[PDB]
Design a protein around this nucleic acid. Structure first.
Length: 48
DNA sequence: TGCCGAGGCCGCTCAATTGGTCGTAGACAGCTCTAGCACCGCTTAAACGCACGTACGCGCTGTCCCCCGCGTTTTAACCGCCAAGGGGATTACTCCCTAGTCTCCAGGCACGTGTCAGATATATACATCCTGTGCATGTACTCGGGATATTG
């Protein structure tokens, strides 16, 4: 699944939820560095 | 009326500081020096400090007597300002030259000792130079009257 959301304040609340119910997750706000986006996309492909 | 135009609030992205973590390299703290030569302790015969009326030198004191201070205000331009213009101090880039590193390499000389002399100190006798004192004039001063210079 992809979850899209429209407030950085909310993506923080979603991250607190993803940590509590132990789903595994990965986030890419506009505040992420350009180099992080590369690794993070390449890890969402290539893995179960 | 209309339209809209102009209008006012909120997530990306980048760019210094800020504080954090990594690992590694001499340089700091410390040991044992060890070694030795200064500090000390112990005498001595030594100099020089110091607690202490009195002659008296001058620091301080009670007076009167006047300029420079003290007070006013006009004015006078001094000094401040602002705003504009020109450039020259500044910024950011690219090419370039050497500052700096290391390394090798020598001998110059600053370092060190090895001996012992011409040096200068110290005493006694001493004569002399120099100080403190006393003592005339000669000028550098303060004043008055007139000439030259300069401000308004």
């Amino acid at each position: 699944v992809l979850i899209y959301s429209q407030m950085t304040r909310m993506i923080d609340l979603l991250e607190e939820y993803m940590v509590y119910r132990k789903h595994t997750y990965m986030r890419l706000d506009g505040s992420s560095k350009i180099s992080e986006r590369r690794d993070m996309v390449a890890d969402f492909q290539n893995r179960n």
